[model samples]
Target: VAKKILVTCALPYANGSIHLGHMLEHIQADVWVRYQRMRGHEVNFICADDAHGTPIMLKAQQLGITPEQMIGEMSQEHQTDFAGFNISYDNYHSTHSEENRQLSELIYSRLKENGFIKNRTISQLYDPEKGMFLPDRFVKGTCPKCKSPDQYGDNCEVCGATYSPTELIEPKSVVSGATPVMRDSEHFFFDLPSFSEMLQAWTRSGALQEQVANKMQEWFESGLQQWDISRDAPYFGFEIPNAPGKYFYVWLDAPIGYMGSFKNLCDKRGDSVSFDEYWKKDSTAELYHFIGKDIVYFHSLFWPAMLEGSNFRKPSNLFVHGYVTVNGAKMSKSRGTFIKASTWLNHFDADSLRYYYTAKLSSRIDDIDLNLEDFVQRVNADIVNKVVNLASRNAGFINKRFDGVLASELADPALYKTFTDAAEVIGEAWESREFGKAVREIMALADLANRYVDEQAPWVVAKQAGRDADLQAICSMGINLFRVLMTYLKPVLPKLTERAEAFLNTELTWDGIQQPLLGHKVNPFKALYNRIDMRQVEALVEASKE
Candidate 1:
């Protein structure tokens, strides 16, 4: 059945250029979106730059520019990188836009009217030198869990522990490099605890994975806490509607940016779509959020509660993935593993990384490792040598010897059925987010195609006279099999999809796989992918040192 779905990747912050870590989530989301689109679903995929918060504000100050100018330039670069990587967001807007500001106000007003917002005086970290309140990210100190020095207030990279800023030992403000002191301030909070029962019911009803749901058990046991939704003056975000010198906390508005971006998309598309229909309390559109495990608490706990309070549609599911690690370690500048997306584009094809990541990705929230040597070998051996080689070997003979004409029928109907029969299991993998499983299944089919080519010896058959029909049938079987493989791979390799369409003289779609190309003319074979050179990896790593 055709389904209407709205999807979003976690918003990328405007504080820096996108790195490999950011690509993990965006690529995952884009793959899913492409799969649904190929299946003929109505999918609106939108995302935005998280333009608010202290990191962006401080970054702009350090660069001697206004935050507006900073995000403006950064958004352009982000969009460019995303396009380069084929992240097909329907609309890539900004959290700082007027759309977001208006929506934030509307949601806040609804929360207030529903008695889910409250004001209280709370003690929070304040930077005396900067004369401003400090968000958790602005403070760094010893991690309370592992006693590791110089860790961020929110998490410890060394131990993977999360804690409140108050738990950091001897916290220092990043704004002024001064010791942060406790100060009292009046703040607004969303009464998240008030919705504990509703949240528990929604969470346990399969909105999250079993692993994530199990993790939430600890938070529930401790009782949900009210979420702070306001920040003091000098913060870069939408100000509270009726409160002076206070702004909506970045977390409070970041998720709302999803709806804001969708609305912007509707305006840009001009009346064909209605934003309210998707966001209205009882809207039937299936909404999904693809986020990292680190922020599962925020998206799983606070996001749904906020949506429920504001009478908006709660997400249908939260798909979580682990962070990207390089060589089994966290990405590090000192080790030359912290590679940026643009840096990667300079060294390798976008599909190379996309295919590699998909082959490693699974449904579980397990970290993916990018072992440089393994990347070069696996891509070359799997995609270039095995998959694309099928087309290159067969298409050359068809174009050169047979004048670009395919056979009237498949040489081996049983073999063709073997490839198509696996579609159900592979489709299940894609649907369940087990991308690695799908790739494995596809590669197994590639192995069969290559073996058939070896047994047929089309090159040898082409050398003899009066065997043209036999050669055509053999090569046509190879081409038909190649098309089936490409159909399964189209979600992760969209560029390859375009190439396959041009090669086959037809548009590629999931449903198109049911029919085989017979007696059809095809274009001359062009190189679809090239083998990876190790020097490219060396060059990328060397560039990261700069």
Candidate 2:
């Protein structure tokens, strides 16, 4: 029942630092990957920085540095934050590398040879102040569809309508605040309509959630438009093979970075992993992408079309999630709610945020809110008071009275069986991406363990004459119960797993749960987690202020 899976998060844009919003996707993917590995599956988790586009180019110019230098610094900071938070990526590469360029060229060549690419003159907005043609994002104007003022060229934020920049009533360049003029340029386009039938089938074939699929239905009904795959000379990206001063658009090369990252991993390990077996058209390996709902259009429509045109396998699934909000509102820097990852690390442990997110996450494209007070309460109550309390309370008795040894057998086999049997449902929840379901189930078991401890009163039993065996038996059951709970919580709280393994003197594994730790000696117990203070949460918010 094991499967080979390759997972990726949306490539982090190289223009800015990572914030709590970005951590949502990375933590979600990391938890899923860890669970699959514990289930003994072949899982390759990879991610990369989206290092191209006008934003990065302009940001670098503003900082008085080259694009390469800018992306280089961002990549290091990204990797450090990921490692600090225990995001175990197999390989984290960049889109501005030779491997990505080579893969981009290969896919583009295939699209051209198959006649899925064409060149045509298109009217675009020209920013005279910057002396370049502006992409839709670089221009702001009145919405052509609804006449709403101060709308982005690509879409109207006021009325929620999408249109081209040339259709805007009065457009201005965001780069220099100068009026933009209509200009004509020969641009390359992907024949997206040609792949509409294939895309329709893929979207309905369970690659997307029901809500997401319904959203895609609206797009299909409107009609598919040819996608612009080439950018002008001022862009920092892979240039077209035979065209001078034309480069592949950032979106065109961004998804391909997924493959390039794995290839880089193979090259680094050398002779142990095969890249083509996982990427070829007929391969059976599973492919998944975790992305925010904002980019669902690109991932669900354009990405798969490009892969099919290039004769490669499309993603088996696209797991879409909504944005992160703070206390029922979008994170605002001016309000000091937009906490950066570094700022968060300075105040609280990474596991606190990871656990809080898991408690709120479900298999739906709904936004998650981080209520700081609730975050402190949940981690303290569920993890510290309920889950870890089971182990801490029982381990002390075993280490002190019985010389850190377990009983020869579980005190009550029926109770232990009940805990192990729940793994089937919990495992299914993990496989289906319903982590909230999994967390709830695990906590239910934790509550049962706490109740058992409350009933036994092992401390009271320990003081009685010649009652050592009875006390040992009751606490031994607690230890076994704690072990099972740790295995279930392993994917979310990996750092705590290390401490649990040391205390029980065993490596935590899914299969290891089949047998109880009978007659095994354990290490001295230590405090697993501390209750959160409101001051740390307040300090994090204060630090996020510019």
Candidate 3:
């Protein structure tokens, strides 16, 4: 039996609709969990909406509805979009649930007890005329780093430097355009330096990938910031238990949603096995997180602090991948590159996008360019021409008459060796979260199978008059080849796996693809992907221009 495993995708922020860029992260996480299950591991996948934040509140106000109502509608839309793309989640929940509230309260209380939290009064931007504390986003001025006129107080994109809101020279409130005053307000600060020893130990103990661990060590060594976990509301998040008029910040509650969601699923299981056993039990379960590189700081630093302060099991691995750019730049609306998820789905199959992403995306933090031309060609050569074509062209011939038998002898030893060897490498890559490598190595096997077809000329044998013995021998080799192909490609192309099961007549397994199915008819073949036209690619590129 495979070891039991639990995985969680990053909960998407509900401030806006999901786009191709966002879907990149979601698909990567989903593929990993699905691949593990196919390998016979007992895995459960969980994710939910990060529904509470200032942005959602502002957007809700603009739409003339409560934040809860806005999030409820968006959540439904998100779930629908994900389901259409075949991104399966065992339990998808809202962050505003009662279970989330209780979980946050418990974690918060533990941190407070550990002396990891401190209360302090800090200077905040205040509306002088209205007598209200101004949010950082509400204040704008010339950036000190870039001298960019009319920028926000938090950071300057032109120079990419983060600074305190009060440091903005000659700041004015965006809401009322008033010169705001400085006001002192009390808030909770998570003292990260206190947990430095614990965090350093976790990072040094192989709990994080080498790059991730190294980056974190540099940040901590340079002096880490104390994360502020409380928000003053009129805010959109859950109220901090026993702290009136205060709410937990979105980042603080979002990670805990992972555990709360699992507990919710556990309740539905109708069994008494504890969710804590999988989450809180010391080293019993390996905790892994999949996230985009943009938010590396929060996951590698703040999240670990929250877990260590409460003495919870820290993440065993943190996998950080990159963003999707269009035409080698960050997706922009004016360039017609910020294509929405719904927009892309209307034009192509989900697996085509999956194949292209897996091929282009590497384990490092390199940006992925979603060039339409590359997208079409990669799908055609990798899926349509190589992998699916071999199965389609050969499976039919074997099913019609050869009576599904193993070759009396190996007709193509090279093809068989390629399949077995690729299976081993792909498995290792998937285990290490190096999925780009897994994808490449698997496709290499498909290329070898295509060559095998051309060399043996199975179709030529079918045409020879009364060549029963020759046809039977070639058909047997084809069936074994199809079996091997399915095992290697199952991680990236799941639908193909189902089709292979029916056509090849065997159960999917990770051990090795050496099974023989004598006396069975192959299932009908279908085009894995229709060839994409240059006109469509050109149209797509043009249509994206807004």
Candidate 4:
């Protein structure tokens, strides 16, 4: 069945460069989106820049540029890096967009009218020196849970504990390096505790992973509190209705930007009906959010309740993944493993990084490592030596001797059937988001394909007399098997798939393998995929250093 689906990666913050850590989520989401499209589903893959926040506003001020100008420039940089990595976003927008502003206003007003939003005066941390109420991120102190020094006010990275700025032992404002003092401010709070019963039911439902459910239970044990949804004056976000000098907290409208991006796409394409079909409370269209572990709290509890309270359809599921670690540890500047997206492109093609991540990714929210040493061996061994090698080793006989025509009959029908038979499981794996399993399945067949080529020994056959027909049969069979494997790999390796399609003179489709390419005229193989080594890894690491 062709399904209506909308998918999104967590929006990249407009204040930073796109790094490999950021690339993992986008690439993972891209692979899934591509697979769904290839399966003939109507999938709208949307992403955007989270262009509003204290971080963005402060950074813009420091750079002597308007927030709009800085956000536009950073948005371009983000989209360019994502393009380099082949992230197929339908419409990359900004939260500062009109669509986002209108939607935020509508949802907020709806929630308030329905009694899910209320205001109260609370004591918030204020930077006495800067004379502004400090955002949670702008305040750092000793983590109350782990006692880790220099931890952010709201969360502790050392222990993964959630707490308030007041909970920190000695909160200091990062903006002015001054001790923060408590000051009363009127703020809007979303009645999150009111949705506790509903959220608890969702936690037990089968929509989320067991591990995610488990992590969520820990939050449930602590009790749900009313979430602060508004910031005072001097904030950069959508201002609340009838409340001057008050703005929606950046996170409140952050996920709303997902809808804003999709709505922008819909309106641009004359999609009058789908905006409601996918978002209205009665709709059944699938919506999934791809995010990281750090954000589970907001996306899981806050986001869905926000939607339910506002009469919008909630997410179908939250597909969460862990962080990206470089060389078996966190990406660090001292060791120089924090590789940016553009820096990676300067040294390697996007497909290599995509393939590497896909080969390691799984449905579980487990962190994947990008071990540089292992990366070189794996790309060369799998892509160059095995997958692409099948074509390079076989296509010559078809192009040179056979005049770019494959043999009229496959030399080994049984071997070709084996490659085709594996497609069901591979397709199932991709659909289930078990990408590592899918790659393993494809590479196992790639092993079979390469073994067959080695055993047939086309090069040795070419040297023998009266073996021209035998040589053509052997090489052509190898090419046919390569076709099947490449079709399975199309989602994972976009650029490589294009090169394969060009060589085979046809597009690679999920269901295109049942009919083998026999007697088909293929173009000669071009430079498909190149090999990388440890030297390139060393240089890339050197370049990534602070």
Off by over 4 Å in 4: 127-131, 136-181
- Per-residue lDDT of 368 in model 3: 80
**Candidate 1: pairs in clash:** none
Q: In model 4, which range of ten residues has the least summed lDDT?
A: 229-238
Question: lDDT values of the candidates?
Answer: 0.91, 0.91, 0.76, 0.91
What does candidate 3's lDDT look like per residue over 1-546, in tens digits? Answer: 567777777888887788899888777777788778878777888888888877788789878999999999989988887886778788888787877888898889999998888898888778776555777888899898778888896998788889987888888887668898887778998898787777777778866656777788788779887888888766888898778988998778999888888888888896457577676738576667788877888887788789878877777677788789876888888767788787777767677777777777666777788887777788888777877777777766765655444446766566576677666678778776677788777777777667767777878988889986777666666667767766766666666677667666566777756544444455555554578776875665467663
Relative to the true structure, candidate 2 has a C-alpha RMSD (angstroms) of: 2.9
- Displacement of the residue 334 alpha carbon in candidate 2, Å: 2.5
lDDT value, residue 30 of candidate 1: 91
Please state the error at residue 93 of candidate 1 in Å: 0.6
lDDT by residue for model 1 over 63-83, one digit each (tens)?
899999999999999999999
Residues 154-177 of candidate 2 have per-residue lDDT tens digits of 888788988777778877888899
- Over the stretch 435-528, how does candidate 4's per-residue lDDT look in tens digits? 9999999999999888888898899999999998999889989988999999888888999999899999999887888998888999977878
lDDT of candidate model 2 versus the reference: 0.91
Ranking by TM-score, best first?
2, 4, 1, 3
TM-score of each: 0.93, 0.93, 0.90, 0.93
